Design an enzyme around this catalytic site. Sequence first.
Site, PDB file in Angstrom:
ATOM      1  N   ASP A   2       1.621  -1.832  -0.638  1.00 30.05           N
ATOM      2  CA  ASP A   2       1.922  -2.273  -1.998  1.00 30.05           C
ATOM      3  C   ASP A   2       1.524  -1.251  -3.056  1.00 30.05           C
ATOM      4  O   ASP A   2       1.461  -1.595  -4.242  1.00 30.05           O
ATOM      5  CB  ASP A   2       1.261  -3.626  -2.318  1.00 30.05           C
ATOM      6  CG  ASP A   2       2.017  -4.815  -1.729  1.00 30.05           C
ATOM      7  OD1 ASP A   2       3.196  -4.639  -1.331  1.00 30.05           O
ATOM      8  OD2 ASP A   2       1.421  -5.909  -1.625  1.00 30.05           O
ATOM      9  N   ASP A  52      -4.344  -1.957  -7.073  1.00 33.08           N
ATOM     10  CA  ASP A  52      -4.457  -3.273  -6.455  1.00 33.08           C
ATOM     11  C   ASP A  52      -4.928  -3.166  -5.001  1.00 33.08           C
ATOM     12  O   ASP A  52      -4.402  -3.822  -4.098  1.00 33.08           O
ATOM     13  CB  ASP A  52      -3.132  -4.024  -6.584  1.00 33.08           C
ATOM     14  CG  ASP A  52      -3.231  -5.463  -6.122  1.00 33.08           C
ATOM     15  OD1 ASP A  52      -4.320  -6.033  -6.245  1.00 33.08           O
ATOM     16  OD2 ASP A  52      -2.228  -6.013  -5.604  1.00 33.08           O
ATOM     17  N   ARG A  87      -6.181  -7.847   1.407  1.00 29.97           N
ATOM     18  CA  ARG A  87      -4.850  -8.410   1.587  1.00 29.97           C
ATOM     19  C   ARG A  87      -3.759  -7.353   1.494  1.00 29.97           C
ATOM     20  O   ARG A  87      -2.633  -7.606   1.938  1.00 29.97           O
ATOM     21  CB  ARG A  87      -4.585  -9.503   0.542  1.00 29.97           C
ATOM     22  CG  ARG A  87      -4.843  -9.043  -0.861  1.00 29.97           C
ATOM     23  CD  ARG A  87      -4.177  -9.959  -1.881  1.00 29.97           C
ATOM     24  NE  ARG A  87      -3.875  -9.244  -3.116  1.00 29.97           N
ATOM     25  CZ  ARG A  87      -4.753  -8.983  -4.076  1.00 29.97           C
ATOM     26  NH1 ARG A  87      -6.010  -9.401  -4.004  1.00 29.97           N
ATOM     27  NH2 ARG A  87      -4.360  -8.283  -5.136  1.00 29.97           N
ATOM     28  N   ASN A  88      -4.044  -6.200   0.885  1.00 31.87           N
ATOM     29  CA  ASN A  88      -3.071  -5.123   0.767  1.00 31.87           C
ATOM     30  C   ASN A  88      -3.374  -3.992   1.738  1.00 31.87           C
ATOM     31  O   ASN A  88      -3.035  -2.836   1.467  1.00 31.87           O
ATOM     32  CB  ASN A  88      -3.002  -4.587  -0.663  1.00 31.87           C
ATOM     33  CG  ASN A  88      -2.248  -5.512  -1.605  1.00 31.87           C
ATOM     34  OD1 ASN A  88      -1.287  -6.176  -1.206  1.00 31.87           O
ATOM     35  ND2 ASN A  88      -2.650  -5.518  -2.876  1.00 31.87           N
TER      36      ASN A  88
END
Lengths: 291, 303
Positions: B154, B136, B140-141
């Site tokens: 994450d 992922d 945003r991570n």
Amino acid sequence: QALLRILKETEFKKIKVLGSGAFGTVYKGLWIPEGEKVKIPVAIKELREATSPKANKEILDEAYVMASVDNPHVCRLLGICLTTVQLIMQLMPFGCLLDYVREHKDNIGSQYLLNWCVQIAKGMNYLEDRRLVHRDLAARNVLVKTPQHVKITDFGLAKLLVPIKWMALESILHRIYTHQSDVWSYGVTVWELMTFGSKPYDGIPASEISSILEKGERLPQPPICTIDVYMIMRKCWMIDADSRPKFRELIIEFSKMARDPQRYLVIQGDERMHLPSPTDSNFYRALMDEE
Amino acid sequence: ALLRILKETEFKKIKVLGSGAFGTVYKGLWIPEGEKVKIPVAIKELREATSPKANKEILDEAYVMASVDNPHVCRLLGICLTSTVQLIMQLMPFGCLLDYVREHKDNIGSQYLLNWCVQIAKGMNYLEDRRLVHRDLAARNVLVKTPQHVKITDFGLAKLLGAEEKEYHAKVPIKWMALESILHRIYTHQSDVWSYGVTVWELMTFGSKPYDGIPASEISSILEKGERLPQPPICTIDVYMIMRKCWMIDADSRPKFRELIIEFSKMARDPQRYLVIQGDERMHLPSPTDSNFYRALMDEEDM
Ligand SMILES: CSc1nc(-c2ccnc(NC(C)=O)c2)c(-c2cccc(NC(=O)c3cccc4c3NC(=O)c3ccccc3N4)c2)[nH]1
């Protein structure tokens, strides 16, 4: 020179007061870096009396040396604002060791006390290696980053500015300050730690302290201290400065005692008293002490 | 020992920072036993797991998340396995890189953008070397520790939580995933290099949404037909070419993270040759004084 960041009043603000003194006031503050929407916690010391630009130039000159101390057991000045002398450094949530050992009186394992002695001797050995004389080492001038990690602060402040009960005889009589007088002070600071924060010479008035030191009186053996530890404290307070231990030797002696703390400190509760634990240590470290 | 199991009594959530598909992030306070201090921390309370996993399997996966030791990957620091799964990590006051490039749109100098590509690739090349797959990766991570220093976050959570079947058509980062992962649910270091290509495209567009207007359920088909993300306006073809190689259908033809590290490091040394940004010469590069102050204050980590 790039180790000290010159701040402007508009990029930080004081948020809450933490402590005061003759030197100045201590604040929790917030740094707001230019063009960002973050507020970063800092500690700030505002000095009592501002002064001229010529005095500010002297302060800045000294601030450049303070900014250059790199050692895990000494506080580094990070930034300064010349209004009126605000000194900026990393915020420690725990405050000073004197308050810590008073708050945690009789609740501290032997392992912590001797590790603090080691660390403070390391910090002072560093200063000596850099040819800095502290001139006011005391438990109130050691800050707690984590219960496992202490740091000396405010070295040289006495100069740019009178703790008689911490001062070597030669410093009382002749205003002589060396690294060996800092060793006398170190000894009083270990005494402070070992009595869980008692005041030294707590009866005696400051003006009579030089008298009793010449008569050969010294601070008494703290209850928890074996004769081995009190021996080291008594050497720190010999009249002939050069007869006192070197900070490098204190690191070694205290380091050996900390490999077996229950041998050198007799504390009611010690066996089941909290120590480090690798899990907690990684945790403190990863959270707030990656240095 | 790399992972602290916490009791609910020794921390408290204080303020919500943001919500994703995997969970909500709070600013919270740790209170060490026997002390009267509150240590700021970040708490991610996890949404319900589709794959329904034993408290022990979690622990075995949290121990692997606690083992990542790299300047450019966030390490899991602790866990609470109560009524929910709450992950504790170090608080990053700057927030995520996606929010950050959006907020500083057209105010970011090429040296920063390329340096962020270096650090992200360094972060992923470490995970590859440990034989771990993120799954992922996206802007945003990536978290901002300082503007000079970003970290992938994450890791592991996609494996941890799974996903219902319906989420694969509407969660599943469809628009960041390799074609194999969308089709067959294969995840490799090369499907991670696809998400990295998208992540880079997010940075160079200052946080635009990939394939905006295309429903996620049709991403499958457009990729097979050969549609890709367009060249961001500030990218020279050198940069765009690299992003395009990341999105090749043949997983083995995409670059390796170690190759990406070198290529972007080279571009980082001459950043105006590879990104064309209006007013780049007036963009803040960080003076050593400023970098030193950030590091001593907030970022004492190794490199
Ligand atoms: C003793 S009490 C106390 N506690 C804190 C503190 C800090 C962090 N977190 C906390 N948290 C909590 C919960 O309390 C407290 C502080 C403090 C706060 C900000 C700055 C500083 N020091 C310096 O800048 C400094 C550093 C090195 C040497 C000196 C320094 N100072 C001088 O003046 C000086 C002037 C001229 C010449 C030499 C000097 N010497 C000290 N002081």
